[model samples]
Target: APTSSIEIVLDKTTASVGEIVTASINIKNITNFSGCQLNMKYDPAVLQPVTSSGVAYTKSTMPGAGTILNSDFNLRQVADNDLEKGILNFSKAYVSLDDYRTAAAPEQTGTVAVVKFKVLKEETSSISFEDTTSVPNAIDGTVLFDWNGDRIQSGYSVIQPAVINLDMIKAS
Candidate 1:
């Protein structure tokens, strides 16, 4: 069975407090994949969500010649009553009626989305795709589906969560 995985890559491993950083979400070995949805968790106290014009901090980009069916990047408070979770709802499919929806999947290994965050405190925190024991750290669910809205199961489907660590340092 082919293994599929989604990995998060940070632009920089280390940063100072009050600095902004970018994270790229990459997917691999997904055959006939049309869309994906991800819920990422982080420590709100250590990392702040960057926003602009009343929008939450998050951005998404597809591969070359790829199209999107629907996308949403927003910060939402979870059960803990803290805005430490970000939800990414993205869908891409093949279409013939629209210009932006006509392209097929660009590459097997390509970025699904790019997210931005601001370092708030001088502490070591993590942006995780898995569930954690802490209040601010957790995962809801992540999934991939085909154009027919059918969940991609085993064999050609593999999903590996990507966890990113952020070690922030205070500026001298």
Candidate 2:
């Protein structure tokens, strides 16, 4: 009776600099429903949603699980100060496979949204030196998804375990 069965999957598990990755938030219908809704909560610091062909990227028509009329969207960086402690909420999204099949006469396919973008080279950063005094030494930067909601404080998901990981290399 829970929608926890759904999962979000990225095409690649790991990636280098400037690589496009495909993201899919799959909503498996654990319960029989005419339609469904999704509340996507993400940390602004790690992964960002942007409209430009900038740092984080996505495909042009990445399908949405819920009611998003215009699926075209982008991944951008959160404002500097906001990244310290901010939660990005994707509100009001729905997808109707039945409607798509009937009106468009498409096959009976599951609900999905698609988008595309290239990871620009400008976002890469590295420190030339390491400070032994700090808690961590020679820290290499990385974008991570904490879907388990374990890495940080005050993060939670309503349905399914939080899906989080690094965005890696993907084709079109």
Candidate 3:
């Protein structure tokens, strides 16, 4: 069993109302990344998932890895949203394949997926990861832990929006 960690990164802290904002799904520390479950929340009134063709799980830093898409829900690039919670849903993770036990959660570090949203109003939004189901799993079914076994949530890593008042500033 190995340890894995994840985080979020944005392209811009401030974006115009008509511009596109990016939320980069990244893994800080991982060993044999089996797969990851990513789900994030944002201010839906200010933003919406980019309605474009083939806008699901993108191979961000792991261009050589493989991924699985969720069925029915969030199936389209434009519909990956949780209408009730204002949370954008995207279920996937890249690990590549399986043959000689060589293609499971491959080890590395960096972004695994990238999500885009279109600014809609003169408001702000914070694209942050969910605390529970939103985590990377080790191929051996192990979750990320400190060397002392202190599980990393926000302690380890959680969606850090603009704490410096870091936010997607959508101008009118």
Candidate 4:
């Protein structure tokens, strides 16, 4: 199995109360990776997921052949509660059964999705990959597979979250 790592990228580490921010989910060092599916976790207290606000996952980079199979691309917020927590599920397949495979496994770094949030309060918040074993409600790392029946080793992937610091200033 090839090694891979996943991480969350925040546009900015700092923000003000009532401000809006964007965070991107990224993957790198993937071997023979045709597609990936993963879940993410975020704090609703400090940041609120912005849905229907034109904020959603947008593919940034393509894999080896530089094209993402349209029929297999998917991104969505599978769960949402109050300003407490949320979950994002995203997956994309570069190779399709109907279409002939042209691109090789994605071995470079690229973004999987972009998530938007509204700053609710002045505090530190974080967006992280959920570990199913530790957080029963959440799912873990990328699940990569191809139509050829080849699968990437789950244990070889490393996933990490991003921390955002927010502050609000009083008016004079």
Candidate 5:
């Protein structure tokens, strides 16, 4: 089996509200025997995913701008009045054969798993998001570690850094 790694890079370090940026997630096939397929999750409530906003992914091999990748879920906001712990499951990660793999290889190349929409500044105020992802299989489809397959011990979920200077829109 081969060892594969995933890298995530944003087009811009900083962006304004209503502006569009690209988040390029690259899956590198480091080993010769094993292949990799990466799955990413994002919340529109935090950072909007843009396909045609003109932002680009950090890796050159991944998909380019204007490409709709996959489904997305909105982040759950923590109400000001609530005192209980807020549960957030905005996104999830899993290696997919249909979205990340090609027909010829089936499971052999670093493919673009997802491309996000544009980020809306108004919706993002003081809130931040966190996520986790894992590869169910690395080589053949079998239960080596569990029902998913060989789990990448080194590979962790895709977590976007919290916003720093994102200002909220004030109501009149």
Candidate 6:
């Protein structure tokens, strides 16, 4: 059977300066999706992950997923290339131990996880999934993207990374 691809999607493409930009990672039309490992890279200089509340602005927006991780195990932020780029990483992410929806299909969180950033200093930036290393899997550590040694498609194949066009709103 062919497998579908879950996606990391931003709520909007453009955000004015002094506003928030949101990215949502979700699963849909998937089966036995036990774990999802994700690593995201974005321009830290252009966007800052909001953190003022106890929960922080970047988080699991739904209860349908099992973990953001139990500890500082792997969930982290790393600045690579002098702040022009950085990666937000997550691991040990298991969704609903047969409770939220069902084992047949995890349904969705409407949004499995969410990341909000403060659009800084006007410059176009991209938030992208490192699909090469990042992975989603089923039982016994079998990944979704690899089945019978071939990559499968879901629907409407648009493999664009989450690109943010930061355009400041002027008093026009």
Rank the candidate models, highest lDDT first. 4, 1, 6, 3, 5, 2
C-alpha lDDT values of all predictions: 0.49, 0.30, 0.46, 0.54, 0.34, 0.48
Candidates 1 and 2, the one with greater TM-score: 1
Q: How high is each candidate's TM-score? A: 0.59, 0.36, 0.57, 0.64, 0.38, 0.56
For candidate 4, the C-alpha RMSD (Å) to the true structure equals 7.1
Model number with the top TM-score = 4
Residue 142 accuracy (lDDT) in model 4:
52
Tens digits of lDDT, candidate 1, 1-172 = 2366666667776677877767666667666555555556667666655543224444442212212233331212112213534433333433322332245543345676665777776665667554333412222345555545456555433334332333232331
lDDT of 5 by residue, 1-172 (tens): 2344344455554566666555554444422212223333344355543334455223222333221123221211111111122212211222343333332232223433344435565343222222223334422211112113244444333334433233433331
Q: Which residue pairs does candidate 1 place in steric collision? A: none
Estimate the TM-score for candidate 5: 0.38
- Model 3: ten consecutive residues of lowest lDDT: 61-70
- Is 3 or 5 the stronger prediction by TM-score? 3
Per-residue lDDT tens digits for candidate 3, residues 1-172, read 1244465666776676777776666665554333444456667677666534424333231211222222222222222445446554444432223431343333346665565667777555566655434344422222343222233343234435531124433342
lDDT by residue (tens digit), candidate 2, 1-172: 3432334445554444456444454434322222222323334333444433443323221223322233322222222112223222232222443443345422112333332223333232211111122213111111112212112112222233332222321321
Comparison by TM-score, 3 against 6, better one: 3
After superposing all C-alphas onto the true structure, candidate 1 shows an RMSD in angstroms of 7.9
Give the C-alpha miss distance for residue 127 in model 2, angstroms: 26
lDDT computed for candidate 2: 0.30
Clashes of each: 0, 28, 5, 1, 12, 0
User: 67-98, model 4: which lDDT tens digit per residue?
Assistant: 23323423222232223335554545544532
- For candidate 2, give the lDDT of residue 66: 29
Give the clashing pairs for model 4.
44-83
Q: Cα lDDT for residue 143, model 3?
A: 38
